[PDB]
Write a protein that binds this ligand. Structure first.
Ligand code: MET
Ligand SMILES: [Cl-]
Ligand SMILES: [Cl-]
Ligand SMILES: [Cl-]
Ligand SMILES: [Cl-]
Ligand SMILES: [Zn+2]
Ligand SMILES: [Zn+2]
Ligand SMILES: [Zn+2]
Ligand SMILES: [Zn+2]
Ligand SMILES: [Zn+2]
Ligand SMILES: [Zn+2]
Ligand SMILES: [Zn+2]
Ligand SMILES: [Zn+2]
Ligand SMILES: [Zn+2]
Length: 238
């Protein structure tokens, strides 16, 4: 009734929501955060009706989820970007890549494709022109003989000792104890197309609960919380 149940991955959405509880209480609502540890279940729960909203994804991921699963869900206002970061225990600069080196990448086709294009933009390889999805099979030039290890996203943090470098979502990196200042060698450009945001059932588009959530999530308090906790790795888009 006056309870809002939001599903979220701990970092950054879960902890942001937790610190916004008092502000939500000021709007006359109680907030409960349901923790999820993966990118699949939060949307199921949302479409099932178990949660009022979720905070873990960007709109492109949601659109792909809607296409594959037929969820009746929707992206809200852009909140913050979480640029992909390339981590390494073995080198400090992308200039230090050499023959035989291995990069761990997600087996998600969109993430994989996007990661390969990041590596292209820094001159490490070349891909065919266009905007379609690319894979390691499509690499035209590969000067430094970089091999790619395609893994489940949950496995990538623990792979860092066994590979040269790895692309890891901040949602996975931070709870795994990875420090981007210490071990990050490349951060992806800011692109608000990939801004994480609140998602909710299309039916609840104009409901007060979603309205309350998006108010507090775009507040000055929300901005300062993001900046104070993540300092550079999660960037507000409001
Ligand atoms: C579940 S879509 C990926 C979300 C992740 N925090 C990112 O922006 O990279
Ligand atoms: Cl809670
Ligand atoms: Cl319905
Ligand atoms: Cl309703
Ligand atoms: Cl203001
Ligand atoms: Zn806290
Ligand atoms: Zn207040
Ligand atoms: Zn809680
Ligand atoms: Zn899970
Ligand atoms: Zn309903
Ligand atoms: Zn509702
Ligand atoms: Zn060095
Ligand atoms: Zn350089
Ligand atoms: Zn202000």
């Amino acid at each position: 009734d006056k309870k809002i149940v939001v599903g979220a991955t701990l970092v950054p959405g879960g902890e942001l929501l937790e610190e916004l509880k008092p502000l939500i209480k000021e709007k006359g609502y109680t907030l409960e955060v349901k923790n999820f540890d993966d990118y699949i279940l939060p949307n199921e729960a949302l479409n099932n009706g178990e949660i009022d909203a979720n905070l873990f994804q960007h709109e492109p991921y949601l659109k792909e989820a809607v296409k594959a699963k037929g969820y009746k869900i929707m992206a809200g206002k852009k909140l913050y970007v979480c640029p992909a970061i390339l981590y390494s225990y073995k080198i400090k600069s992308v200039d230090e890549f050499k023959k035989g080196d291995t990069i761990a990448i997600s087996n998600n086709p969109s993430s994989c494709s996007k990661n390969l294009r990041y590596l292209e933009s820094i001159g490490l390889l070349t891909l065919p022109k266009g905007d379609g999805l690319v894979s390691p099979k499509d690499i035209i030039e590969n000067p430094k003989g970089i091999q790619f290890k395609e893994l489940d996203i949950a496995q990538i943090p623990s792979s860092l000792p066994d590979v040269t470098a790895a692309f890891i979502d901040t949602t996975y990196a931070v709870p795994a104890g990875l420090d981007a200042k210490k071990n990050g060698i490349y951060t992806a450009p800011i692109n608000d197309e990939y801004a994480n945001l609140l998602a909710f059932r299309t039916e609840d588009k104009d409901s007060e609960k979603i309205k309350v959530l998006q108010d507090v999530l775009t507040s000055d308090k929300a901005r300062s919380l993001i900046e104070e906790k993540y300092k550079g790795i999660v960037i507000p888009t409001f």
